[PDB]
Amino acid sequence: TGREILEKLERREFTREVLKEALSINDRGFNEALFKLADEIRRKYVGDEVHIRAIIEFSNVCRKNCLYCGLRRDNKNLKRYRMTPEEIVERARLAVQFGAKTIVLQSGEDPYYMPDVISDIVKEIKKMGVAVTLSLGEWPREYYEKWKEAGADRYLLRHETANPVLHRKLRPDTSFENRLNCLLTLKELGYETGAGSMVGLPGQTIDDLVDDLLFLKEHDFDMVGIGPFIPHPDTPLANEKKGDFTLTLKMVALTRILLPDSNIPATTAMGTIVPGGREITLRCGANVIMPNWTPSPYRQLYQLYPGICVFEKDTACIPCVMKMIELLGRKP
Numbered sequence: 001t002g003r004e005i006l007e008k009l010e011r012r013e014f015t016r017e018v019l020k021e022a023l024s025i026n027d028r029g030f031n032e033a034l035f036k037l038a039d040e041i042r043r044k045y046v047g048d049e050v051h052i053r054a055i056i057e058f059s060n061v062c063r064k065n066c067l068y069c070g071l072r073r074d075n076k077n078l079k080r081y082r083m084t085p086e087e088i089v090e091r092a093r094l095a096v097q098f099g100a101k102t103i104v105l106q107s108g109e110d111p112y113y114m115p116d117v118i119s120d121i122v123k124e125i126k127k128m129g130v131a132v133t134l135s136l137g138e139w140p141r142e143y144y145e146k147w148k149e150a151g152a153d154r155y156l157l158r159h160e161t162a163n164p165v166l167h168r169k170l171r172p173d174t175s176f177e178n179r180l181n182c183l184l185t186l187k188e189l190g191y192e193t194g195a196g197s198m199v200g201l202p203g204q205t206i207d208d209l210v211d212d213l214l215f216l217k218e219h220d221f222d223m224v225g226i227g228p229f230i231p232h233p234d235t236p237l238a239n240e241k242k243g244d245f246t247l248t249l250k251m252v253a254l255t256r257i258l259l260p261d262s263n264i265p266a267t268t269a270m271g272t273i274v275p276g277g278r279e280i281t282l283r284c285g286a287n288v289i290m291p292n293w294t295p296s297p298y299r300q301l302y303q304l305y306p307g308i309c310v311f312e313k314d315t316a317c318i319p320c321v322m323k324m325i326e327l328l329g330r331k332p
């Protein structure tokens with residue numbers, strides 16, 4: 001029964017069948033025990049602080065054509081935007097004035113900025129003594145070099161799916177082979193690396209998720225970003241089925257059990273498909289929240305998927321997460 005799989009997880013007996021079983025069992029008692037276990041493992045290793053890492057989505061211009069993503073280059077209806085370096089810096093400064101100690105710079109793959117514009121922004125943002133995390137997709141090692149020289153500390157590059165065939169199909173411009181290489185180049189260059197994948201992708205199976213789990217535990221990532229697949233109306237997957245919240249929550253919990261030292265965000269996608277989804281995820285293994293500091297009107301134009309916090313004032317949302325972290329009994 002579920003008790004058997006549970007004890008192997010406590011003994012850290014992580015094998016392909018144990019995780020497949022764990023992901024397969026849909027008994028309410030087993031699920032709730034799994035989350036309680038991950039909540040306790042979270043509390044033990046990373047404590048009660050919920051890291052608040054503000055993110056700025058400074059460009060929705062992308063060169064790739066990912067089938068799931070609304071920023072794919074074939075999305076013609078989406079209005080495109082680019083923030084100026086002055087706008088990104090004064091925005092990060094505002095986030096630091098509100099208490100952010102990490103600045104996450106994310107965009108579609110927009111060549112306009114690469115690589116010297118990113119370096120200048122990073123150099124400026126690093127003058128405030130905060131960690132800078134980049135999430136800019138796949139670029140040459142030479143580009144990763146310069147950004148590390150500019151003061152960059154962390155890089156986010158979700159592996160999306162550890163199935164090479166499912167990867168190539170969903171991301172035509174590249175492969176899991178290249179994606180895995182970019183991750184290894186970053187760890188090699190001294191970056192703190194974040195991986196992760198989507199749950200509920202079309203054609204994704206329980207075995208794929210176990211592969212995602214095994215891939216994660218193998219490379220022992222500093223950070224892991226996990227979210228449900230949300231179909232975008234202007235994409236080749238507009239009518240596929242969204243990722244399941246409970247199943248995605250189990251991927252978070254098992255990630256916490258497998259990587260008890262890792263920083264695991266409570267992604268916005270989780271709060272999008274279930275009201276209060278992020279709060280739930282923070283109590284099942286997650287210990288990071290990434291408030292959106294992208295200013296209007298660009299924020300509504302950054303549609304990886306259709307989205308929360310879209311009407312709230314550009315500020316306003318950091319005091320919201322601090323309130324949320326408080327009502328959860330955690331610290332910021």
Ligand SMILES: C[C@H](CCC(=O)NCCC[N+](C)(C)CCCS(=O)(=O)[O-])[C@H]1CC[C@H]2[C@@H]3[C@H](O)C[C@@H]4C[C@H](O)CC[C@]4(C)[C@H]3C[C@H](O)[C@]12C
Binds near residue numbers: 033039
């Ligand atoms: C709030 C509800 C219902 C609580 C409830 O209704 N329980 C009875 C109250 C007990 N009292 C103290 C009042 C004394 C009993 C006398 S009384 O007769 O009034 O029940 C409980 C029931 C199941 C609980 C979740 C699951 O575990 C999974 C997971 C474990 C993590 O770790 C923490 C997060 C999460 C999502 C949990 C959150 C929360 O915790 C839930 C929803």
Ligand SMILES: C[C@H](CCC(=O)NCCC[N+](C)(C)CCCS(=O)(=O)[O-])[C@H]1CC[C@H]2[C@@H]3[C@H](O)C[C@@H]4C[C@H](O)CC[C@]4(C)[C@H]3C[C@H](O)[C@]12C
Binds near residue numbers: 096097318319
């Ligand atoms: C931007 C303005 C003007 C003054 C200013 O520009 N201040 C820079 C602060 C920079 N830091 C955060 C690094 C200082 C930390 C001091 S600390 O005591 O944490 O060491 C200052 C004045 C009052 C400040 C808010 C309140 O206070 C309440 C709350 C405290 C949290 O914490 C962070 C969030 C929040 C909402 C604050 C945000 C921001 O800050 C405010 C708006």
Ligand SMILES: Nc1ncnc2c1ncn2[C@@H]1O[C@H](CSCC[C@H](N)C(=O)O)[C@@H](O)[C@H]1O
Binds near residue numbers: 109157158197230
């Ligand atoms: N439709 C969707 N549903 C859920 N997550 C999505 C999504 N579309 C994109 N994402 C997630 O959003 C993340 C940021 S994509 C932005 C950075 C860069 N272009 C890159 O691809 O890495 C991706 O890793 C992906 O996992």
Ligand code: SF4
Binds near residue numbers: 064108109137304
């Ligand atoms: S996931 Fe990233 S690289 Fe792929 S289309 Fe979206 S923004 Fe571009």
Ligand SMILES: [Cl-]
Binds near residue numbers: 052053101
């Ligand atoms: Cl931090």
Ligand SMILES: [Cl-]
Binds near residue numbers: 053102104154
């Ligand atoms: Cl980060």
Ligand SMILES: [Cl-]
Binds near residue numbers: 227
């Ligand atoms: Cl997200």
